Each structure stands twice: as C-alpha cells, then as structure tokens.
Amino acid sequence: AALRPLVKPKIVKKRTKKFIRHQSDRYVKIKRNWRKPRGIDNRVRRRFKGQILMPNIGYGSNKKTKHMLPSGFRKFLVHNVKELEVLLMCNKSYCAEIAHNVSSKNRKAIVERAAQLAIRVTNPNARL
Amino acid sequence: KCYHGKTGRVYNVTQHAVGIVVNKQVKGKILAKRINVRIEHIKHSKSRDSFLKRVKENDQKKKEAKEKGTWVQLKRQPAPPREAHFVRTNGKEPELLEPIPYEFMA
Amino acid sequence: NFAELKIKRLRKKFAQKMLRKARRKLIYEKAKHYHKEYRQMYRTEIRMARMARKAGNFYVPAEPKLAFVIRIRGINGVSPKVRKVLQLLRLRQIFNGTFVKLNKASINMLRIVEPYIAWGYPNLKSVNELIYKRGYGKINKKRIALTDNALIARSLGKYGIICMEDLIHEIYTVGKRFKEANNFLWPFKLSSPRGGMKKKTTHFVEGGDAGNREDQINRLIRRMN
Amino acid sequence: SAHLQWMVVRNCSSFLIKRNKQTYSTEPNNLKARNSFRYNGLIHHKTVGVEPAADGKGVVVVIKRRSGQRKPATSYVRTTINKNARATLSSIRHMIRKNKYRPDLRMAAIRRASAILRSQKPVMV
Amino acid sequence: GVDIRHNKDRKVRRKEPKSQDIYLRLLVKLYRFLARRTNSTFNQVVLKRLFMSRTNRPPLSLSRMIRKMKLPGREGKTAVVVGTITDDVRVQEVPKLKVCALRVSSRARSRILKAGGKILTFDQLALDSPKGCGTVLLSGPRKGREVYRHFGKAPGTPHSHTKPYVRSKGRKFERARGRRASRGYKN
RNA sequence: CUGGAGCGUCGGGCCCAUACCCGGCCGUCGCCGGCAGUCGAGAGUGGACGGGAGCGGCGGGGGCGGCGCGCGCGCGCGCCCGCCCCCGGAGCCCCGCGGACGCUACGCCGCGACGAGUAGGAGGGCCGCUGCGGUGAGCCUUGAAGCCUAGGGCGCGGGCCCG
RNA sequence: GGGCCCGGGGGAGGGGCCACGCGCGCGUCCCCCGAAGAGGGGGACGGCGGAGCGAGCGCACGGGGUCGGCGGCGACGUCGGCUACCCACCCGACCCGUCUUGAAACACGGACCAAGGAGUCUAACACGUGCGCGAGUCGGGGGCUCGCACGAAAGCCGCCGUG
Ligand SMILES: [Mg+2]
Ligand SMILES: [Mg+2]
Ligand SMILES: [Mg+2]
Ligand SMILES: [Mg+2]
Ligand SMILES: [Mg+2]
Ligand SMILES: [Mg+2]
Ligand SMILES: [Mg+2]
C-alpha cells in the first residue's frame, strides 16, 4: 500500500516474447540480439510460414502506456539526492530508481528523503 | 514512312513545299518535329472542320436567343438512353422463330 | 452596454432558432415532394403498361439511366487498358462500388472491363441502403462520414442539394448535378457477399457473376451491405 | 529578451538533465522542474519560486524584483511564510494573483507549496 | 488491396529552416503565427521564403531595386526582400526608399540612409503592416548563379549552347573535333 | 470407395486466407490543418454616432425554401420621464479585460488516407564503441571497470535499466 | 395520371396536415358581395404589420464512442509473476552465407569458441547544403607579439592584394 499512481490504465502488450536472432539457438557464436537477416534465399527475411517473427513498427506499444512499469510509474534513474527533488512534482506519474553504483551509506539517505515527500522508489530495500 | 498517316499543323510555306510540325513517338518521349513535305503528299484534314461548324453555329445560336434570354443546349452530349416509347402490332401476332434443324451441307 | 449587448447576442441566438427551424422544415417538405415523385414514377410506369396491354399493344420502358457498378476481382494480373478504366470509375480497391450514369460513352467503358465488374440497375431501396449505411462524403479530400446533413449542404449547397434526402434525388433521377453529387460521394466500401458468389470468373449469363445483370443486382446489394 | 535566451538554453544548459525518456531542469526556483519556457527560472524577468525553508518548517517565496536585472545579488528577493497550510496557500495565492505577477505559475506555485508541506510532518508508520 | 502508386505521394518542400541561426528561427516563429491567422497571402509567401536556402533567395542589387520601385504607381510603398540588399556602384541617383531585408551590406546601408530613406527588419515590418499592406515583394535573379550556365541540354548536341566545364579556357582547350567544321564536325 | 467417396447435369447448406466489412492499437504521408490566448458550426458582418420616431418592423415565392422571423426591439426597475449602469466580478458552452494542465513552438492536438520488398537511395536512431572541449557541488574502499547470474522490468529493436 | 392541378359548388360529419391566433386593410392572386370601379366579406399565397407575440421544469433519446446511485467468494500453506528455466501437447516448420533465370540441393565456404578483421586519408573537380562578408572576398607565405603550461594556440599588420 505505497504511493498509488495517478491513473492505472489497462496495460496491453501486443507481443510479450523477445525477438531472438535467426539461428541463435544452433550456434553459440550468435547472441539473441536481433539482426535483420539479409540472405538472398534466407527464409525469415522473406516472411515465410511458421518462422521466427521479424520486429516491425506496427508491433509497438500504446502511446499512453509506453515505458510504463507494471505499477504505473515510469522509472527515473535518480543518481544522488539533489536529483530527487526534480521528481517532487512529477511524482504521482513517475517514480525514482536509485543507480546501481551508489554507495550503501547515501543509498539510504536517498530512500528516506523520498519517503519524506512521497516518491515511490522501486529498489528501496536494496543494499542494507 | 513513319509520318505516313499522321497529321500536323503548318508553320512554313515555300514555293512548292510546306513545313509542317507533327508528333513522332520514340521509345516513350514524344518529339514535336518539323518536316518539309512537297504538296503532292498532303491534304486538308477535315478533322478540324466538324468544329468551326459547331463553332459558327454555337456563336450564332448564342447571339440569337440572347434577345430572348432562353438558355440553349450549346454543348454536345453523348447518345442518351433511348427514351421509353410504344410498339404497336396492328393485327398480327409476331412471327414465330425456331432454330432450324442442322443438316450437313458440304 | 451590458443589456444592449445581452439583447444583441440573444437576438443572434434566436435568429438561428428561426433559421435552423426554417431549414429543418424546408428539408421536411422537400422530403414530401420526393415521396410524391417516387410514387408517381412507380405507378405511372405501371399505369402505362396496363394501358398498352388493353390494346393489342406493347411497352418498352425507358432505358435505365443509372447503374451501380461493383468491382468483383482484385488487383494483380490486370490489363493496362482495364486498369485505366477501373480508376476512372473509381473502383480502385477490390469490392467497392460507385453509381455510374448510363450513357453511350459510359456503357462502352463497361464493355471493356466486363470480366472485372458486376453492374446493374438499382432500385430505390438499394439507393437508400447504400447512401445511409455506407455513405461517406469527400470533403477536403477526406473520407468523412455523412453523419449530419450540414456536411452535405456545406459541399453541395450551390446546387439546391441541402440534405441527405436531396442527395438521393440527384442519384435516382439522374438530374442536372449527378456530376457533383456522385463525385462528392466517396466510393462505397461494401463487405463480402454473405452467401457467396456463383463464379467470380465467368459472366452472369453463363451462370457466373461478372458483367451486367439488369435489376438482379439488388439481391447482390442486400447480401453485400 | 526571454525568447532569445530560450533559444540558447533549450538544449545546452547546465541544469538540463535528459535520461530515461524524460527531460528535466534542476535550475533554481522553477516549479515542477520542467525544461520549458513558462516554467523556467533564469530566462524570464518575472519569476516565482517556492522552496522549503532552511529550518525544516515553512515555505519561502522567491520573487524576482525586475527593478534591475543583471544584478543577481539583489535582483532577486525572498520571503518566509510559516503558517497553517490554508493561509500558507492563500498567501502565495494573493501574492501571485491580484499582483499580476506571472499568473501562469499561479497554480503550479500552489501545488508546489502544498507538496512542500506534505513533506514536513510525521513521515510513516 | 489498393492500387495507387506511392511513388510521389510524399511532397518534398521545406517546412522549417534547415539552418540553426536562432534569429531566423525567431522571426520564423513570428510568421509561423501570422501566416496561419491573417487572411494575407503576403506573409504566407514571406514565411515560405524564410525557409529557403542561400542559393535560393539570391541577393537583390540596389539598382534592380530602383527600377522595380520607379514603375508608375508603386510610389510610397515599401520594398520587401527576404534576402540581402547589395550595393550597385554603377548607379548614383538614389531615390528615397523604405526597405526591409534580412541583411543589408554596410555600403548599401549608407547610400540608403544618406538619401533620407529608412530600413526596417522583418519584425518592424510585422508592426508596420502585419497584413503586408502597401508592400512590394522582390527577389534577385535566381537564374543568376554562374552554375545555371552549365545546365541545359548538353554542350555538343545540335545548336544547344551550354558552357562546358574546362579546367582553364584557352586556345588548345576544347576547339577541336566537334567545334570547328574543319576538324571532324561541329555542333 | 461400387444404387458410390465413380462419371455428366443441378440444388440447397456449410468450411477457410495476411482478401473485403466494422472495431482496436502502431507508424508514414496528406490537411495552403488547429494551438503562442479566441466564438463559432449550410454563417449569411460588427460597431460608432446623429436627426426623427415606435408596436414599428422589410406587408417581396404551394415557394415548398435558402434573405430575414417569432425567446423579446421596449424592458424590468427607478416613476408620462430617467435608466437600459461596473466582469477585481457575467458567474461562466463564450467571454474579444487575462490566459491551458497543454505552451521542450524543431512542443502539443484534431482529422482523414495509406504501410510487400532484393539491387539501391534517403531519413531517423535518450542504438552502441574509444578519445577530447565543456558540464553534471555526478558516482566511488559503506566497493569502480569487468565478469556471473531458473533475480524484477522497459523499449517494435539497436540495446537498456535494476536484484 | 399530372399541373400538391383550377375551382365557383354540394357531402356530413370521408380521412389525414411540422398550419397558426383572433383583431384588422397589405404586395399579389382567386372567389364571393360589389358597377367591371371605389370599397367590403371569405379564401389561396406571399410577405412580416392592417397581427402574428410571448417562458419554465422533465422524460429523455433508436440523441457529439459505457456506465452502474449493482452485487459474491477468498485467506499461513494458499494468492498473484505476462516474459525468461525444464517438461508436455496440437498446428507450422528443409541449413545458413553465396553466385544465380532458378538452391533444402547429388552446387561451393562453414567442427566448435574466443580476440583480431575490410569503403580509409590526400589532392582535384562537380552539385547540394550551412555560415561570414558582398562587386568584392580571402589567404598563404611572410611579418609584429614568448621561455607555450594551456601555444608549437590566440591576437594584430597602408601587409589585404604582390596574388
Ligand atoms: Mg490472378
Ligand atoms: Mg484467368
Ligand atoms: Mg515497407
Ligand atoms: Mg573502460
Ligand atoms: Mg546455371
Ligand atoms: Mg539434386
Ligand atoms: Mg566457385
């Protein structure tokens, strides 16, 4: 029961699965990162039947719920304390995310200064 | 031979020939090119002369009926639907037609 | 100032409740005329055949002036000259339709694309159905739905056409303005024919679906609206 | 002129922070940190600011004086208000409006005042 | 299942100045406003010019600006050039003018003021006549660049005279096969 | 498979494509598009100001009607005469006196249309790698880079953020 | 059958009407009384004055894109987790790169994994674009100013026009 969002819509995601690269399974030399196949006789680039899907634009998220966390707030990579009072107003729409490489001492000081002015933090119970 | 059958307007007149501009299509782009042709290979095309007779009549039918103000059909107009009428057979039924039996003539 | 403006605007307020009344009533009574005409035209074509039949005589009704053309085959593998016509009738996408005005030049353009289209003489109810349910008007080069008739007058008011019902006069009784009436109508986009066709390839006369079907096209417009 | 600076500062500012598909401005005495034209502190010549009092309790109201700018030492006057969250709000209310002092910030100034006070009271269970 | 050519459906015209100079971007902010609002097509042309390139809004000489203002009737109006006013050393009787321009070369600036004239900029022109009332729009000759000479049919095609690119003109540089009838042929 | 699941000529009914229809979203193009503080929806003027006067009006088409009429002109109040007044307040569906939350003006917004692709071109890439001039009162022995992770997620994706 | 046909007229209480007041003295027209006229009465029609006229709450709505002023079970070994781990199934599905009219090919390269790895610089044109100045405009070489920290920078020179 922490910091409801302003508006919690119905988030729909047209495709939830990743887009692995063609043949990224057979070979280990190939990462799962997408690369648009450009073979002449390649069977994915000519969008054949029952083949892995090529990402295109009409496949993309709703303009309202884009970049939206499952709770409702967009993340903000807050890096220290002074960069938190930026969110003092845009707070019921989006929230604070403490940077990985923040020391454990001030990683605390960022937490309870946020709980002061009601800025939900997604990684608030982190280092300890 | 590529101009044989083609029309074009006249732009020059020498003693027994006539300079004349026609269009000649070549792989696409149409080139308006001017040739010199002696008169024996030339006629007056009445293609123009249907109009200038629709014109002399249109200009006339507009100067008149202007003292009246009644608007007249000046434009041509394509062949309309044939305008429901009657047919009258007088004292005969129509003639009965039957497809005729085949027979090999040779 | 205040109560000299207050009145000045209220007058302009009511001066509309006059006009939008008079404009509402004019439409109402123009719609009574088009009730009397469309009834007299039906009857007086029966009036006549009854009168020739009494004598030993015959009737040839008027050659239909209005024909509603649907395209029935899609777009690939289509001739050059065919493809030019079909974009002059505005049957661009497959399976849409337009009201063409019958005419020596028009008829001789349907002969040349006959294996692609299916045209015929529409009746009144067929004209209504198309215009109301699937009638969109071309305004500022947009397919804008004909939801209110201040959109029809806003485009056609210079021709005495002021309402949804006045459009249908100029579409039935071909009339002086068929050129502007049936070019602000965006091509009707009809669904597939519920129940199926007979044979998209062959002509109606040999059991198919193409070409002209006089007056039988109305069955094709029900199942395709 | 204001419109001039804003074309030098739209990007390329030491207070502009662009990450995570948003943009923001950490400049002093701008309400809601918007990298904007209305809601900017330096560019303008009449600006309203609202930040917590340094004591822990209260609200301080920065008003640019406009008497003479390019005088940053005094061009820029503050004041303090420690009151009851309803007069507090109605002080910045009467101070921005019925003074015809940038009645764009008028509401954004209040929503920043209120959100300041919510941040100085018993924090949590 | 539609059959239009999408070849040239996207219209290629400039809708913003490709340049970064904040000043031009500012009075573009002004006539991005006037153009939408006032019925005057005037600024719709002024706006549609503030986009164009240096190579496309050429400089207007000062003398070509006289003989276009000397014509009977356009007395008392203001010359309006989306461009620069250059000087013309081959002209001396400078009548009094009211000019607007983006730039005016410093020499032409003193010929105009000394003759009891006035020069404005495109923001005072917005306050003089926001509708563009009582104005004259002008431009330099866009077919003036020496580039436009190398354009055309071709050099060497029949009676189509077009300057060829030659590293340096002279006797022995392109007067041979194709130019003198004596040496090969000529066109 | 054999009065058929065979061959002709025909019915109805049904089945299904990324085709067509309606709807949802994503982008591209178009709109001489709207929005930097404004009335106004076939818009078919608005405003002084003077003289005279008033139930007057503008006594014009079965047109079916568009340009003129029945929510008011003048009116209630002050009492035939005066007014018919001021938004620091009319109380607001129009507000022209001051303008959005919205207005990063290369921002935001409303309409439509449309989106196959090699060779190739162009555009956009808060896609990524190393280094410099700036800048982040940036981060860091309370643990940086790298590496590892059936840990939580964001982006159509390049990739990215967190545990 | 059409002239919303003409209509002087009669029914005989024929049906149906987005008609609209009577008072009264208009434009026109029709009818009737009237002299054919003046004028009157009635009607059509127009129009807007010889009238017309003039306001309040409801359902709504088969009315500019859905809301309920409706409700019910669940809770320390049971709720929620799209995507990614393993497994299962139904449908789909031939191995990539390449030259090629045509590649899953009985065409060739490829066991696997790491790191390395290929449109660069210079000069010369050309057009497009940005910026300074504009019948001019430079830029080099020199010169005048430093041991450079930043400098082998920056600044300046009838040199700036010898060219
Ligand atoms: Mg085919
Ligand atoms: Mg075939
Ligand atoms: Mg594409
Ligand atoms: Mg490193
Ligand atoms: Mg071969
Ligand atoms: Mg083989
Ligand atoms: Mg080989």
Coordinates of C-alpha atoms in Angstrom, one line a residue, chain C residues 45-213:
Chain C
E45 CA -44.8 3.1 -65.3
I46 CA -47.4 0.6 -64.4
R47 CA -50.2 3.0 -65.5
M48 CA -48.8 2.7 -69.0
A49 CA -48.0 -1.0 -69.4
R50 CA -51.6 -1.5 -68.2
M51 CA -52.8 0.8 -71.0
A52 CA -50.8 -0.8 -73.8
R53 CA -51.9 -4.3 -72.7
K54 CA -55.6 -3.2 -73.1
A55 CA -55.0 -2.5 -76.7
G56 CA -53.2 -5.2 -78.7
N57 CA -50.0 -3.3 -78.0
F58 CA -46.7 -3.2 -76.2
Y59 CA -44.5 -1.2 -73.9
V60 CA -40.7 -0.6 -73.9
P61 CA -39.8 1.1 -70.6
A62 CA -37.1 3.7 -70.6
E63 CA -33.5 2.5 -70.9
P64 CA -32.2 2.7 -67.3
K65 CA -30.2 5.9 -66.7
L66 CA -28.5 4.9 -63.5
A67 CA -26.3 1.8 -63.0
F68 CA -24.5 0.8 -59.8
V69 CA -21.2 -0.9 -60.5
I70 CA -19.2 -3.2 -58.2
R71 CA -15.7 -4.5 -58.8
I72 CA -15.5 -8.2 -58.1
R73 CA -12.0 -9.2 -58.8
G74 CA -8.9 -7.9 -57.0
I75 CA -5.8 -6.1 -58.2
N76 CA -3.0 -8.1 -59.7
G77 CA -2.6 -9.5 -63.2
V78 CA -4.9 -6.8 -64.7
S79 CA -4.5 -5.4 -68.2
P80 CA -3.2 -1.9 -69.0
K81 CA -6.4 -0.6 -70.6
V82 CA -8.5 -2.3 -67.9
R83 CA -6.6 -0.7 -65.1
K84 CA -7.1 2.8 -66.6
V85 CA -10.9 2.4 -66.8
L86 CA -11.3 1.0 -63.4
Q87 CA -9.5 4.0 -61.9
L88 CA -11.9 6.3 -63.8
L89 CA -14.9 4.5 -62.4
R90 CA -13.0 4.8 -59.1
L91 CA -13.3 1.1 -58.4
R92 CA -9.7 1.2 -57.1
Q93 CA -9.8 -1.3 -54.3
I94 CA -11.4 -4.6 -54.9
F95 CA -15.0 -5.0 -53.9
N96 CA -16.2 -1.4 -53.7
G97 CA -18.9 0.3 -55.8
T98 CA -20.0 3.6 -57.4
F99 CA -23.1 4.9 -59.1
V100 CA -22.2 5.4 -62.8
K101 CA -24.6 7.3 -65.1
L102 CA -25.6 5.3 -68.1
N103 CA -24.7 6.8 -71.4
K104 CA -23.2 5.8 -74.7
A105 CA -19.7 6.6 -73.5
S106 CA -20.3 5.1 -70.1
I107 CA -21.8 1.9 -71.5
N108 CA -18.9 1.5 -73.8
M109 CA -16.5 1.7 -70.8
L110 CA -18.2 -1.2 -69.0
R111 CA -18.0 -3.4 -72.0
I112 CA -14.2 -3.1 -71.8
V113 CA -13.9 -4.0 -68.2
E114 CA -16.7 -6.5 -68.0
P115 CA -14.7 -9.5 -66.7
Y116 CA -13.9 -7.4 -63.6
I117 CA -17.1 -5.8 -62.6
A118 CA -20.7 -6.7 -61.9
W119 CA -23.2 -3.9 -62.7
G120 CA -26.9 -3.5 -62.9
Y121 CA -29.9 -1.1 -62.5
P122 CA -30.5 -0.3 -58.8
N123 CA -33.9 0.2 -57.3
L124 CA -34.9 2.8 -54.7
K125 CA -34.4 0.8 -51.5
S126 CA -31.0 -0.2 -52.9
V127 CA -30.1 3.5 -53.3
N128 CA -31.2 4.3 -49.7
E129 CA -29.3 1.5 -48.1
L130 CA -26.1 2.4 -49.8
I131 CA -26.4 6.1 -49.1
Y132 CA -27.3 5.9 -45.4
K133 CA -25.4 3.0 -44.0
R134 CA -22.3 3.2 -46.2
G135 CA -22.4 6.8 -47.4
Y136 CA -19.3 8.9 -46.9
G137 CA -18.7 12.3 -48.5
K138 CA -15.5 13.7 -50.0
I139 CA -14.8 16.9 -48.1
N140 CA -11.3 18.4 -48.3
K141 CA -10.2 15.2 -50.0
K142 CA -11.2 13.2 -46.9
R143 CA -13.5 10.2 -46.4
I144 CA -15.7 11.9 -43.9
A145 CA -18.8 10.1 -42.6
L146 CA -22.1 11.6 -43.6
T147 CA -23.5 11.9 -40.1
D148 CA -25.3 15.2 -40.3
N149 CA -26.6 17.0 -43.4
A150 CA -24.9 20.2 -42.6
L151 CA -22.0 18.3 -44.2
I152 CA -23.9 17.8 -47.4
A153 CA -25.1 21.3 -47.7
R154 CA -21.6 22.5 -46.9
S155 CA -20.4 20.9 -50.1
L156 CA -23.4 20.8 -52.5
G157 CA -25.4 23.8 -51.3
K158 CA -24.6 25.6 -54.6
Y159 CA -26.8 23.0 -56.4
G160 CA -30.0 23.1 -54.4
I161 CA -28.8 19.9 -52.6
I162 CA -29.2 20.5 -48.8
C163 CA -29.9 17.3 -47.1
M164 CA -29.4 13.6 -47.0
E165 CA -32.6 13.2 -48.9
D166 CA -31.8 15.7 -51.6
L167 CA -28.7 13.7 -52.4
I168 CA -30.9 10.7 -53.3
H169 CA -32.9 12.7 -55.8
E170 CA -29.8 13.6 -57.7
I171 CA -28.8 10.0 -57.5
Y172 CA -32.1 8.4 -58.6
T173 CA -33.5 10.9 -61.1
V174 CA -30.1 11.4 -62.6
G175 CA -30.7 15.1 -62.7
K176 CA -28.6 18.2 -63.6
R177 CA -26.0 17.7 -60.8
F178 CA -25.2 14.0 -61.0
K179 CA -21.6 15.0 -61.8
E180 CA -21.1 16.8 -58.5
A181 CA -23.4 14.7 -56.4
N182 CA -21.8 11.4 -57.4
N183 CA -18.3 12.8 -57.1
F184 CA -18.6 14.0 -53.5
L185 CA -19.9 10.6 -52.6
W186 CA -16.8 8.6 -51.7
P187 CA -16.7 5.1 -53.3
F188 CA -18.9 2.8 -51.3
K189 CA -16.9 0.1 -49.5
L190 CA -19.1 -3.0 -49.3
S191 CA -18.4 -6.2 -47.3
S192 CA -18.1 -9.6 -48.9
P193 CA -21.4 -11.1 -50.2
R194 CA -22.9 -13.0 -47.4
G195 CA -23.8 -16.4 -49.0
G196 CA -21.1 -16.3 -51.6
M197 CA -21.0 -15.6 -55.3
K198 CA -21.7 -18.0 -58.1
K199 CA -18.5 -17.8 -60.2
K200 CA -16.3 -14.8 -59.9
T201 CA -14.6 -15.6 -63.2
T202 CA -17.4 -16.1 -65.7
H203 CA -20.2 -13.9 -66.9
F204 CA -23.7 -13.8 -65.3
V205 CA -25.3 -15.2 -68.5
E206 CA -23.3 -18.4 -68.3
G207 CA -24.1 -18.9 -64.6
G208 CA -21.3 -16.6 -63.3
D209 CA -21.1 -13.3 -61.6
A210 CA -19.4 -10.8 -63.8
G211 CA -20.9 -8.2 -66.2
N212 CA -24.3 -6.8 -66.4
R213 CA -27.3 -8.2 -64.5

